[PDB]
Design a protein around this motif. Structure first.
Motif, PDB file in Angstrom:
ATOM      1  N   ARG A  45     -46.239  31.026  16.670  1.00 54.35           N
ATOM      2  CA  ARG A  45     -45.475  31.990  17.452  1.00 54.35           C
ATOM      3  C   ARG A  45     -45.971  33.408  17.217  1.00 54.35           C
ATOM      4  O   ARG A  45     -45.906  34.245  18.122  1.00 54.35           O
ATOM      5  CB  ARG A  45     -43.987  31.885  17.120  1.00 54.35           C
TER       6      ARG A  45
ATOM      7  N   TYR B 171     -48.808  33.755  19.499  1.00 53.22           N
ATOM      8  CA  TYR B 171     -48.346  33.917  20.874  1.00 53.22           C
ATOM      9  C   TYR B 171     -47.841  35.332  21.125  1.00 53.22           C
ATOM     10  O   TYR B 171     -48.137  35.930  22.166  1.00 53.22           O
ATOM     11  CB  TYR B 171     -47.252  32.894  21.186  1.00 53.22           C
ATOM     12  N   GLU B 172     -47.079  35.887  20.180  1.00 55.15           N
ATOM     13  CA  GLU B 172     -46.490  37.209  20.371  1.00 55.15           C
ATOM     14  C   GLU B 172     -47.543  38.306  20.286  1.00 55.15           C
ATOM     15  O   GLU B 172     -47.536  39.246  21.087  1.00 55.15           O
ATOM     16  CB  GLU B 172     -45.384  37.447  19.344  1.00 55.15           C
TER      17      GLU B 172
ATOM     18  N   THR C  61     -41.182  31.666  23.708  1.00 55.64           N
ATOM     19  CA  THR C  61     -41.093  31.977  22.283  1.00 55.64           C
ATOM     20  C   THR C  61     -40.093  33.094  22.023  1.00 55.64           C
ATOM     21  O   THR C  61     -39.287  33.010  21.089  1.00 55.64           O
ATOM     22  CB  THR C  61     -42.464  32.354  21.725  1.00 55.64           C
ATOM     23  N   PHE C  62     -40.118  34.145  22.848  1.00 52.57           N
ATOM     24  CA  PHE C  62     -39.150  35.226  22.682  1.00 52.57           C
ATOM     25  C   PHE C  62     -37.723  34.722  22.852  1.00 52.57           C
ATOM     26  O   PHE C  62     -36.837  35.057  22.057  1.00 52.57           O
ATOM     27  CB  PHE C  62     -39.435  36.351  23.677  1.00 52.57           C
TER      28      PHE C  62
ATOM     29  N   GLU D 204     -36.541  31.606  22.536  1.00 49.62           N
ATOM     30  CA  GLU D 204     -36.161  30.713  21.447  1.00 49.62           C
ATOM     31  C   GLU D 204     -35.938  31.474  20.150  1.00 49.62           C
ATOM     32  O   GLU D 204     -35.151  31.035  19.306  1.00 49.62           O
ATOM     33  CB  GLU D 204     -37.226  29.636  21.246  1.00 49.62           C
ATOM     34  N   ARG D 205     -36.628  32.600  19.961  1.00 47.72           N
ATOM     35  CA  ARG D 205     -36.408  33.393  18.760  1.00 47.72           C
ATOM     36  C   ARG D 205     -35.089  34.151  18.830  1.00 47.72           C
ATOM     37  O   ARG D 205     -34.359  34.230  17.835  1.00 47.72           O
ATOM     38  CB  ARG D 205     -37.573  34.357  18.553  1.00 47.72           C
TER      39      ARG D 205
END
Ligand SMILES: Nc1ncnc2c1ncn2[C@@H]1O[C@H](COP(=O)(O)OP(=O)(O)NP(=O)(O)O)[C@@H](O)[C@H]1O
Ligand SMILES: Nc1ncnc2c1ncn2[C@@H]1O[C@H](COP(=O)(O)OP(=O)(O)OP(=O)(O)O)[C@@H](O)[C@H]1O
Ligand SMILES: Nc1ncnc2c1ncn2[C@@H]1O[C@H](COP(=O)(O)OP(=O)(O)O)[C@@H](O)[C@H]1O
Ligand SMILES: [Mg+2]
Ligand SMILES: [Mg+2]
Ligand SMILES: [Mg+2]
Lengths: 1194, 249, 400
Positions: free
Chosen positions: B236, B239-240, C320-321, C323-324
């Motif tokens: 992640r 990805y970020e 991802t954002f 889910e975070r």
């Protein structure tokens, strides 16, 4: 309005009386005007201004009263907003003739293509789909008790919905038995499928699955065991196995489509049930809520509130609109996302905007979601053929009936239409947003929008979808009202897998994972061609064809076993059967005919890469092969099998035959001189001899005549209809005056295709097979008629026409030079040149012409000539190598192989004619083979030089002569510094300089530079000999060259030197059209109705008419690059005739020639001639005379 | 490139032939336009409308629209374009020499800069088919395994092809293992593209999928690379932080 | 080269945070260079060594030439009072252009409120709107009143007609016509040329974005039961900021500049309202586990915000954002909104359970935002800077 239907007067009696009174006054006024048509006389009529003002007032009142009546009828039956004023007037006016209303039901309804009336046509028993599926109304609607069209049509719609609801209830009750079972009997399942309509079958299965999963999840929560969900998955798998077993078998097309729809449904249902993996135990979990769920409540009195379709937050009702038999979409994750996003937007009262590249399933997904909800979706194609004036009326209709509206590509609209339609969509979407306003009274909710300058009530059930193609964005006013979704990459692998599974393929996943990347390879590794289509639609068609091939192999094996004593088992036959070979066979049979010569090796290389070790074996067709061989022998053509000479041509004609079997409209798009015409003619004759069905072809050049003369026209003043050429031919076949149906009718066009003359043909080429005329007649295409296009290219052809027609590409590699040499030699050895009408029909009357070997001395002379020419006409023969060198040389015209070859063949024909005249002049001493040989070899060299280098400059003529001298053994002239082309071949084998034939004339004191005196020089006599050679065979000889060289004067002098020759000068210009040639024929020729047919011949008997067309290049091309007069001349020199625009009959030319002169096409104002025209014309470069010729002349 | 019977059979040859076809066309066009500009600036050619607008764009640095017949970064100046064009045409000359003399098989052993190619995705497709044809494997059973080798001219296996010029954005590839980096971009020495038979092995949590974008604008996606996560780094984070691979920088 | 190798402090200067303020003397010349000569030499040195600082150094060059306070007016808030009252003639329209998604009519609304001048605001786009606009323009020109015409970028031809009407018209001394737009190419060139143009851009940053978000969403809307609702909005607000600010750092932040804006925020707020109302069913408090986190995440990743996203890697980043951020763990007292911020210390989510507490936490955010707030590396800013620097030079070439 008042003279089109008699019932209009009954509907509006006051208005009819008023118009009758006005019409009387207006006709009296117009008679007064016709008496004195002078404007000053008209202005002086007593009180004419006041009378005209009164007439304008009264006429406006009647027109308004009529518009109000139409609006009232539309308001009573809102679906009438989908038909225009003329269609609406036809519908209400033709009340008694209910059968005239059947052509408008497709516009008003979704799947209703017609209504089924009673024996007396007074009771609407039910409705019918375009395919043929019918829905019988529980309680039939009686027209007699409800004579008003609006009343009984509304009752028909209401009974449609009620019937559909009741039949869905019964179907669900029946299918719950299959759902709650562990072994579905195939016979009972097939009976249930046959009993109910396709949409109801799929909907009932969806309802049953949703009910089972809902019950299961609740049970799982309490029990704590995933057993219920496992049972649901098991049942789905068992039903899928039954469906596969059924779809391998032979089924009716409707039941086959139902089975495919059910398989596509159950694959998705099994996938969703497997997604058991995520361990959902509650019915309120979003893993289940995000799935589209169907809750059927049969006890509800209102049919529109009996079934609820809920996805996530959104919850709609089934509209129970009869959709007929629609095309279900594979429910891919992209389509699942589309469903979720569009349902969320609809619940939020926002429109939907799927955007992406073309062919990603945007509008198809929108339409599929609309049909899933039981809604009527209208797709508005936003191309140039967009009804802007009808957009407001259709929007009002959508608002009133609760239908959906999809725009195919909203960004394709021009700025004005884009802005206006955006304003309308904005007002409708703001009205829809008003429905999400709690303050607005829900009990009484008359939400209205400003449409057509009136307050139109907006039903909450309608929606507007705006499909876009980036590269762009929504209009700024619609950005905040629409939810966008990126539909950019369809899941082609899963689509192919599910469709192959629905076609009976057991290895559906492997074949899909093979065929999707293969189509990507072909779309990115085959030559950029317009007719190439490797998209998703083409892939789906290929998969359907592969399923058909699999089923036909299964049927063949079953029939073979039935003939033998072996038992039959469909599943066993399916198991011991190669699916990969069937897939590759379908791919080849669909793509190979469309491939250019360079792309076939590439296609097979990519194929082997994806399918390793799987070989495509072309079907053997021994009967047609032997018929083709006999026809080719009869027509002097070359035949071959596989790698033999002519093998590519024979495979092309076989592909053309298979395309004729599959499609009713098709194209040959090979370059010029690639064997297209011979292919389809030989196929027609072979089919004639094989099947016994008589074959007739109607070659219709579509550009030698106008569009009005092609499809016919009606006079707006008098409403007098005229049949065009194509319409006349089609009507003749339909009339069956001489049992035309009993004969195979092929309508070949043999001309350039443009988006102007094929617009009326689009409905004929489509699955409709119908021609719509401006008169209003609907001419149905007979089954035997085959529309065929023989074109050179598709540069100016629409993708619609290409898609509607089968494709057979005749690459130039199909026709070999050896094949043309063999054809020339066979024709020379068989057809006598001197014999005209005689021994021409004797060729057909004689299967082998036994006892007619020595038909004429001409035939023997040319047979001896063919013998001497045979050695040179071999694969590596002098002619071939010289032709390769000719291509290397630069020419004044675009070089083509067949132009040079035809010029060479005509020169050889003149050589043997010279041998004949020498034999005639010396009866005592016939030309012994010894001298004949020398002469023919020398004349062959002469003809090669003058045919291959005729267009070339003197330097390139010398280059070709030197190449010939290097590569030949025949004795060439031994001149040290004189070109070979400067020598003539005399009757004897020896050469002789052209300068010997040049006399020394003397001009008189006057006429010293007259425009008709030609001083004989070497160039003059040489070119005159060429003219005589190529005009003995009546070819359209063209002389090209720089201005002032002497083309016009030499042509005129040589033509006038010929005794039996009428020379007509026709100066061409950019304004030249075929009507110039028609006027020339009217002036100098006559039409005579011979028993064979109409013959156009010169009035003066025993004389050949030559049409000296002085500037061939000048006639301007269309915006699609075509000279119409040049196409007319090409038709008249290839097919030997044309078509009269008044009688629509074939007129065969007689004793008419053509000769042309040109300036080089690089000059300003001159257009390059078409290769299909240059094929017949021999072109000669008339260069400047040079110092010696100028010295002599002056 | 000289097309022959055996040459057309090679997918790499066909790709390179198309590349040099496009390269030559643009090369002559751009050179003729620059020659016209030189003639005008020398004073012997009259400013036509096209010549005037071309001169205006060159003086202002705006990339002429008639140029750039291939995919280029958006908003890039004329200087950056002519430098990249010179490098691409030099690569095309070197590839042409190898194909004409080194033989067809040398096209397998030559290291190709994906940035220079006009359509590198077509190159990746060609490589896959090559491997499939040589090993008699079906095309769809091949998956790409990326091995970054710091050893100069590392040995190339039968199915392993060399690619240079790859730029790793925000990560450092050590022992074929990615570790998050605060550097702007780390150049990958010699990326080895190996076309292996597809297996049923489950993608490990320490495996990251990185896009190989055509250029820094991240507008064209060429393919994807599966790399191994080094140390305790969350995918992640990759990805970020926008970790990716660029064919050209 | 020789100076670079010989210098010992060159390395630390090259690795300094603000090298433009301490550029070493690395040029050779016969006579000492004037301050502008040193400025241009430093500008060249910065362009060669540290292009990301070029802009900063360019401002220094402008200062060493036009004074240290040449640009200082621009950082100050725009004072429309004097400009509209004098600098602008009665017949010159005041064009108020905002970036797409931003509004500038409130500025003149407050201007007329403080100036005690009657103003009539009219939303353009409909024919009734056009009639209201032209009748109000006539009334104001004959009576010296202020006219607001909102979103006039929707009617370009009507804008041309308005420009032609204003050219011949002779207004009263107190007449003031304001036309608000969102900067579109459709706007006529003649209207822009014949009117005072004001460009409005939102103040960049997570703090400003969240303040704008909280202000737009009705207080009563965030106050509805259950009490957890406010916290959801906070997360949503944070998420919105984190993506919109990330759009500044494209293509590293987002592969392309998507139009994440107010429409997506409203749709997400509506989704939160609907699903939380369905879950709570009137309860004053619901457990953090009961909140439909899966529903919110899926609808925001595939429908609300993921609709515009067409790249699969951008969709992966959005997932991802989501889910975070949207989990039950966000209701803990130690939830970290952003980790490894600036390389040390990480943003903690406020402990409060009321809207005012969240707005207070937003208002006390340090004014030291870095790309580490957005999840990006801290060097991303540098990349942005250097791009802008190159961009400036490119523009300076087009003015040649
Ligand atoms: N063999 C010749 N004898 C006499 N005059 C000649 C001869 N060849 C050329 N000329 C002269 O050359 C000119 C040719 O005229 P014409 O035959 O009209 O040329 P063309 O080939 O038709 N040119 P254009 O129609 O303008 O492309 C005249 O002035 C002739 O007198
Ligand atoms: N199978 C064959 N064997 C030998 N010669 C052939 C064969 N097919 C065609 N030819 C020769 O080639 C010539 C051109 O063939 P055809 O008339 O079919 O061309 P076409 O494709 O219709 O061309 P165009 O575009 O000029 O109409 C024929 O006139 C004939 O002389
Ligand atoms: N889920 C699907 N299942 C089956 N076919 C599909 C699916 N999605 C797209 N297609 C096919 O892709 C093609 C796309 O056509 P269409 O949607 O009309 O154009 P566009 O994609 O440009 O809107 C259709 O012919 C359709 O048959
Ligand atoms: Mg389409
Ligand atoms: Mg033909
Ligand atoms: Mg002439």
């Amino acid at each position: 309005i008042f003279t089109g239907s008699a019932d209009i007067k009954h509907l509006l009696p006051v208005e009819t009386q008023r118009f009758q009174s006005i019409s009387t006054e207006f006709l009296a006024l117009m008679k007064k005007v016709s008496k004195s048509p002078l404007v000053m006389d008209v202005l002086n009529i007593q009180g004419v201004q006041r009378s005209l003002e009164r007439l304008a007032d009264l006429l406006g009142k009647i027109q308004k009263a009529l518009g109000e009546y139409l609006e009232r009828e539309r308001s009573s039956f809102p679906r009438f907003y989908f038909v225009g004023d003329e269609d609406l007037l036809e519908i209400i006016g033709n009340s008694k003739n209910v059968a005239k209303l059947q052509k408008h039901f497709k516009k008003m309804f979704a799947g209703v293509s017609s209504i089924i009336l009673s024996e007396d046509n007074s009771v609407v028993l039910g409705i019918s789909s375009r395919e043929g599926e019918e829905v019988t109304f529980k309680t039939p609607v009686s027209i007699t008790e409800h004579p008003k069209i609006n009343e009984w049509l509304t009752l028909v719609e209401k009974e449609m919905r009620v019937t559909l609801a009741k039949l869905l209830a019964e179907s669900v009750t029946e299918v719950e038995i299959f759902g709650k079972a562990t072994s579905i009997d195939p016979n009972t399942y097939i009976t249930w499928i046959d009993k109910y309509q396709a949409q109801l079958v799929v909907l009932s299965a969806q309802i049953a699955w949703s009910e089972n999963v809902e019950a299961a999840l609740s049970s799982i929560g309490g029990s704590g065991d995933s057993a219920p969900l496992q049972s649901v998955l098991s049942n789905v798998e068992v039903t899928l196995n039954v469906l596969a077993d059924s779809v391998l078998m032979e089924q009716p097309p409707l039941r086959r489509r139902k089975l495919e729809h059910l398989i596509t449904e159950l694959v998705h249902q099994r996938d969703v049930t497997r997604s058991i993996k995520s361990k959902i135990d509650n019915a309120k979990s979003f893993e289940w809520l995000s799935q589209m769920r169907f809750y059927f409540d049969p006890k509800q009195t209102d049919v529109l509130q009996q079934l609820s379709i809920q996805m996530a937050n959104a919850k709609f009702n089934y509209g129970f609109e009869y959709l007929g038999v629609q095309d279900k979409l594979v429910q891919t994750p992209l389509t699942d996302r589309c469903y979720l996003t569009m349902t969320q937007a609809l619940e939020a009262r926002l429109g939907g905007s799927p955007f992406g590249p073309a062919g990603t399933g945007k509008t198809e997904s929108v339409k599929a979601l609309g049909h899933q909800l039981g809604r009527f979706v209208l797709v508005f194609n936003c191309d140039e053929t967009f009804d802007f004036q009808a957009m407001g009326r259709i929007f009002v209709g959508l608002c009133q009936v609760g239908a959906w509206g999809c725009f195919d590509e909203f960004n394709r609209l021009e700025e004005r239409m884009l802005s206006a339609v955006s304003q309308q969509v904005q007002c409708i979407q703001e009205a829809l947003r008003e429905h999400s306003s709690p303050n607005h009274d829900k009990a009484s909710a008359p939400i209205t929008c400003e449409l057509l300058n009136k307050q139109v009530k907006v039903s909450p059930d309608m929606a507007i979808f705006i499909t876009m193609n980036p590269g762009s964005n929504l209009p700024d006013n619609l950005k905040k009202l629409f939810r966008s979704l990126a539909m950019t990459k369809p899941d082609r692998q899963l689509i192919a897998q599910v469709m192959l599974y629905s076609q009976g393929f057991r290895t559906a996943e492997v074949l899909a994972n093979k065929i999707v990347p293969f189509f990507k390879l072909c779309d990115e590794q085959l030559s950029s061609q317009s007719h190439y289509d490797f998209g998703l639609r083409a892939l789906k068609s290929v998969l359907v064809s592969a399923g058909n091939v699999k089923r036909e192999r299964i049927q063949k094996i079953k029939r073979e076993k039935e003939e033998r004593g072996e038992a039959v088992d469909e599943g066993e036959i399916a198991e011991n059967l190669p699916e990969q070979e069937i897939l590759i066979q379908s791919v080849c049979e669909t793509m190979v005919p469309k491939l250019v010569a360079e792309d076939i090796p590439l296609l097979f290389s990519l194929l082997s890469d994806v399918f390793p070790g799987v070989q495509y074996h072309r079907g053997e067709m021994t009967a047609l092969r032997e018929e083709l061989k006999k026809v080719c022998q009869e027509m002097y053509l070359t035949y071959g099998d596989g790698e033999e000479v002519g093998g590519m041509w024979v495979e092309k004609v076989l592909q053309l035959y298979q395309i004729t079997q599959i499609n009713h409209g098709l194209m040959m798009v090979g370059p010029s001189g690639s064997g297209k015409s011979m292919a389809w003619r030989v196929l027609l004759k072979a089919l004639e001899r094989l099947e016994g069905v008589e074959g007739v072809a109607h070659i219709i050049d579509p550009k030698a005549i106008s569009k009005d003369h092609l499809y016919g026209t009606l006079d707006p003043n008098t409403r007098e209809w005229t049949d065009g050429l194509f319409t006349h031919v089609l009507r003749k076949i339909i009339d069956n005056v001489r049992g035309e149906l009993q004969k195979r009718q092929w309508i070949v066009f043999d001309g350039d295709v443009d988006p102007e003359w094929v617009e009326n043909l689009n409905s004929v080429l489509d699955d409709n097979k119908l021609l719509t005329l401006p008169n209003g007649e609907r001419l149905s295409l007979p089954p035997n008629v085959r529309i065929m296009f023989e074109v050179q290219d598709l540069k100016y052809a629409t993708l619609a026409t290409v898609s509607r027609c089968g494709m057979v590409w005749f690459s130039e590699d199909v026709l070999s030079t050896d094949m043309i040499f063999n054809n020339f030699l066979a024709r020379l050895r068989s057809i006598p040149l001197d014999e005209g009408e005689d021994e021409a029909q004797r060729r057909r009357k004689g299967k082998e012409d036994e006892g007619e070997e020595a038909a004429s001395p001409m035939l023997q002379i040319q047979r001896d000539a063919a013998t001497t020419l045979q050695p040179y006409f071999t694969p590596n023969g002098l002619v071939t190598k010289a032709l390769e060198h000719a291509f290397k040389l630069e020419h004044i015209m675009d070089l083509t192989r067949l132009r040079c070859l035809g010029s060479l063949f005509s020169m050889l024909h003149q050589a043997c004619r010279n041998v004949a005249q020498y034999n005639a002049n010396h009866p005592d001493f016939p030309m012994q083979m010894e001298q004949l040989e020398r002469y023919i070899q020398r004349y062959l060299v002469y003809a090669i030089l003058w045919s291959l280098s005729g267009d070339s400059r003197l330097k390139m003529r010398a280059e070709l002569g030197e190449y010939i001298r290097r590569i030949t053994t025949v004795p060439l002239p031994a001149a040290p510094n004189i070109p070979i082309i400067d020598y003539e071949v005399s009757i004897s084998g020896e050469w002789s300089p052209w300068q010997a034939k040049v006399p020394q004339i003397e001009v008189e004191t006057h006429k010293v530079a007259a425009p008709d005196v030609v001083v004989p020089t070497l160039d003059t006599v040489r070119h005159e000999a060429l003219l005589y050679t190529w005009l003995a065979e009546h070819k359209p000889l063209v002389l090209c060259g720089p201005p002032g060289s002497g083309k016009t004067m030499t042509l005129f002098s040589a033509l006038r030197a010929l005794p039996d020759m009428e020379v007509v000068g026709l100066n061409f210009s950019s304004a030249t059209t075929p009507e110039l040639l028609l006027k020339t024929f009217d002036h100098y020729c006559e039409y005579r109705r011979t028993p064979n047919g109409v013959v156009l011949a010169p009035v003066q008997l025993g004389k050949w008419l030559v049409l000296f067309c002085d500037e061939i290049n000048l006639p301007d091309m269309d915006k699609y690059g075509t000279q119409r007069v040049i196409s007319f001349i090409r038709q008249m020199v290839e097919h030997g005739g044309f078509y009269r625009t008044s009688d629509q009959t074939w007129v065969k030319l007689e004793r008419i020639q053509f000769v042309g002169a040109c300036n080089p096409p690089t000059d300003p104002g001159r257009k390059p001639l078409s290769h299909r025209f240059l094929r017949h014309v021999p072109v000669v470069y008339v260069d400047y005379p040079g110092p010696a010729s100028l010295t002599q002349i002056y | 490139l000289k097309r022959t019977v055996d040459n057309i059979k090679d997918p790499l040859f066909r790709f390179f032939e198309r590349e040099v076809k496009m390269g030559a066309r643009l090369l002559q066009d751009v050179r003729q336009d620059l020659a016209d500009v030189v003639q005008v600036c020398e004073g012997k050619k009259k400013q036509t409308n096209y010549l005037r607008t071309l001169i205006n764009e060159l003086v202002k640095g705006i990339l002429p629209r008639s140029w750039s017949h291939y995919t280029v970064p958006a908003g890039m100046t004329v200087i950056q374009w002519v430098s990249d064009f010179s490098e691409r045409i030099k690569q095309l000359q070197s590839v042409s020499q190898a194909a004409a003399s080194g033989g067809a098989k040398e096209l397998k052993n030559i290291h190709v800069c994906l940035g220079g190619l006009f359509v590198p995705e077509a190159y990746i497709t060609a490589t896959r088919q090559y491997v499939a044809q040589a090993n008699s494997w079906s095309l769809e059973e091949l998956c790409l395994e990326v091995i970054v080798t710091t050893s100069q001219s590392a040995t190339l296996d039968a199915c392993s092809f060399g690619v240079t010029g790859l730029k790793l954005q925000g990560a450092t590839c050590s022992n074929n293992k990615l570790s998050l980096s605060n550097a702007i971009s780390t150049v990958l020495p010699l990326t080895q593209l190996r076309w292996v038979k597809q297996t049923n092995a489950e993608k490990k949590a320490n495996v990251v999928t990185l896009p190989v974008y055509l250029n820094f604008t991240r507008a064209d996606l060429i393919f994807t690379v599966d790399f191994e996560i080094a140390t305790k780094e969350d995918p992640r984070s990759f990805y970020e932080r926008g970790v990716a691979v660029l064919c050209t920088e | 080269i020789a100076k670079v190798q010989a210098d010992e402090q060159f390395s630390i200067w090259l690795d300094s945070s603000s090298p433009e303020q301490t550029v070493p003397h690395l040029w050779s010349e016969e006579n000492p260079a004037t301050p502008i000569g040193q400025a241009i030499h430093r500008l060249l040195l910065i362009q060669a060594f540290r292009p990301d600082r070029l802009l900063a150094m360019a401002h220094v060059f402008v200062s060493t030439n036009l004074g240290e306070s040449f640009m200082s007016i621009m950082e100050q808030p725009l004072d429309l009072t004097h400009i509209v009252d004098t600098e602008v003639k009665p017949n010159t329209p005041v064009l108020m252009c905002s970036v797409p998604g931003y509004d500038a009519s409130g500025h003149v609304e407050d201007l007329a409120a403080e100036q005690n001048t009657q103003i009539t605001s009219i939303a353009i786009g409909s024919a009734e709107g056009f009639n209201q606009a032209d009748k109000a323009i006539n009334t104001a020109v004959k009576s010296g009143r202020w006219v607001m015409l909102k979103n006039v970028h929707l009617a370009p031809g009507w804008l041309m007609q308005l420009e032609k009407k204003l050219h011949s018209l002779q207004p009263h001394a107190c007449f003031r016509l304001f036309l608000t737009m969102e900067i579109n190419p459709k706007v006529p060139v003649n209207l822009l040329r014949a009117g005072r143009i004001f460009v409005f851009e939102p103040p960049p940053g997570v703090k400003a974005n969240m303040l704008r978000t909280f202000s737009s969403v009705p207080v009563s809307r965030i106050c509805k039961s259950p009490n957890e609702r406010a916290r959801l909005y906070f997360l949503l607000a944070w998420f919105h900021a984190i993506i919109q600010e990330r759009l500044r750092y494209a293509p590293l932040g987002w592969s392309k500049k998507y139009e994440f804006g107010e429409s997506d925020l409203r749709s997400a707020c509506d989704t939160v309202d609907t699903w939380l109302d369905d879950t709570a069913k009137g309860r004053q408090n619901i457990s953090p586990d009961k909140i439909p986190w899966s529903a919110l995440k899926t609808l925001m990743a595939q429908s609300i915000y993921g609709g515009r996203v067409d790249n699969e890697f951008d969709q992966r980043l959005l997932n991802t954002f989501l889910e975070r951020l949207f989990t039950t763990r966000s209701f803990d007292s130690e939830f970290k909104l952003a980790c490894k911020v600036d390389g040390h210390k990480d943003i903690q989510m406020p402990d409060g359970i009321r809207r005012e507490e969240f707005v207070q936490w937003v208002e006390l955010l340090p004014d030291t935002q870095t790309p580490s707030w957005l999840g990006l590396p801290n060097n991303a800013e540098r990349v942005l800077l250097t791009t802008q620097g190159v961009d400036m030079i490119s523009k300076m070439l087009k003015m040649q």
